[PDB]
Amino acid sequence: VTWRFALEEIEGSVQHLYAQQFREQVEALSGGRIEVDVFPYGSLAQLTELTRNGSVNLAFASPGHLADTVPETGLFNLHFLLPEEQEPARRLLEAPAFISAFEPAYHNAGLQLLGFVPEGWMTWTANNPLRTPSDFQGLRFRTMTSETAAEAFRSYGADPVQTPFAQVYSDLQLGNIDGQSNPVFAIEEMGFHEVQNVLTMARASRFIASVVANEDWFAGLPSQERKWLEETIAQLSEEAWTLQEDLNKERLETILEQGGIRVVRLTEDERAAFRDASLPARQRFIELTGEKGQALIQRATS
Interface with Na ion (CB under 5 A)? 197, 260-261
Of 170 and 283, which has the nearer Cβ to Na ion?
170
CB of 192 to Na ion, least distance (A): 10
The continuous run of DSSP H or E covering 17 comes out as helix 14-30
Nearer to Na ion, 222 or 259 (CB): 259
HSE of 66, CA atoms in CB hemisphere, 13 A: 30
- For the CB of residue 184, give the shortest distance to Na ion in the complex, in Å: 15
How far, in Å, CA of 40 to CA of 224, rounded?
A: 27
Comparing C-alpha atoms, which of 122, 105, 153, 140 is closest to residue 288? 105
Nearer to Na ion, 30 or 197 (CB): 197
Nearer to Na ion, 82 or 261 (CB): 261
Residue of closest CB approach to Na ion: 260
CB of 158 to Na ion, least distance (A): 21
Q: Which of 291, 300, 302, 301 is nearest to 104 (CA)?
A: 291
Using CA atoms, how far apart are residues 32 and 15, in angstroms rounded to an integer?
A: 23
What is the distance between the alpha carbons of residues 26 and 34, in angstroms, rounded to a whole number?
A: 7
**Which residues face 176 on adjacent strands?**
none
Minimum CB–partner distance for residue 26 and Na ion (Å)? 43
Q: Which residues contact 43 (CB under 8 A, 6 or more apart)?
A: none
Amino acid identity for residue 183 in this structure: P
Q: Measured from the CB atom, is 152 or 261 closer to Na ion?
A: 261
Shortest reach from residue 194's CB to Na ion, in Å: 7
